[PDB]
């Protein structure tokens, strides 16, 4: 099928050019499902911690987004305790020139640079919005109790 080549494609790719601090491939021999890890970006209050995800490539695949879940606890306006990412390229902006490594840069961005005007979690958002020293503070923390 053509989400299987593109899929295969991605992966030597990924393998070629290797994202800045991320991974990401099949454990295993499913292809339409795979493992990321992104380490916490440098001067994100999320550095030193390790992030954990699952990717679920759908059969249309690149015509339809991947299914991202963030599966390591994290502190943050846009993600929630269901791992959900509220990413715009990872619904209505998706487009098939969009790759996994696209998708995982986006996600270290967001890390650096939360969207606190479309918050999945109101208090985080509002903390951000309000008193980004204490975010930072707690955010934090919980890289510290949770992501490593």
């Given at each position: 099928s053509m989400a299987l080549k593109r899929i295969?494609?991605?992966?030597?790719?990924?393998?070629?050019?290797?994202?800045?601090?991320?991974?990401?491939?099949?454990?295993?021999?499913?292809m339409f499902?795979?493992?990321?890890?992104?380490?916490?970006?440098?001067?994100?209050?999320?550095?030193?911690?390790?992030?954990?995800?699952?990717?679920?490539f759908?059969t249309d695949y690149?015509?339809?987004?991947?299914?991202?879940?963030?599966?390591?606890?994290?502190?943050?306006?846009?993600?929630?305790?269901?791992?959900?990412?509220?990413?715009?390229?990872?619904?209505?902006?998706?487009?098939?020139?969009?790759?996994?490594?696209?998708?995982?840069?986006?996600?270290?961005?967001?890390?650096?640079?939360?969207?606190?005007?479309?918050?999945?979690?109101?208090?985080?958002?509002?903390?951000?919005?309000?008193?980004?020293?204490?975010?930072?503070?707690?955010?934090?923390?919980?890289?510290?109790?949770?992501?490593?």
């Open positions: 295969h494609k991605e992966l030597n790719d990924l393998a070629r050019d290797p994202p800045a601090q991320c991974s990401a491939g099949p454990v295993g021999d499913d499902h795979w493992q990321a890890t992104i380490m916490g970006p440098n001067d994100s209050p999320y550095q030193g911690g390790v992030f954990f995800l699952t990717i679920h759908p690149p015509f339809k987004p991947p299914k991202v879940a963030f599966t390591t606890r994290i502190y943050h306006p846009n993600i929630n305790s269901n791992g959900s990412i509220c990413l715009d390229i990872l619904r209505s902006q998706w487009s098939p020139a969009l790759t996994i490594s696209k998708v995982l840069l986006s996600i270290c961005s967001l890390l650096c640079d939360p969207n606190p005007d479309d918050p999945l979690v109101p208090e985080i958002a509002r903390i951000y919005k309000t008193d980004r020293e204490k975010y930072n503070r707690i955010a934090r923390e919980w890289t510290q109790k949770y992501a490593m």
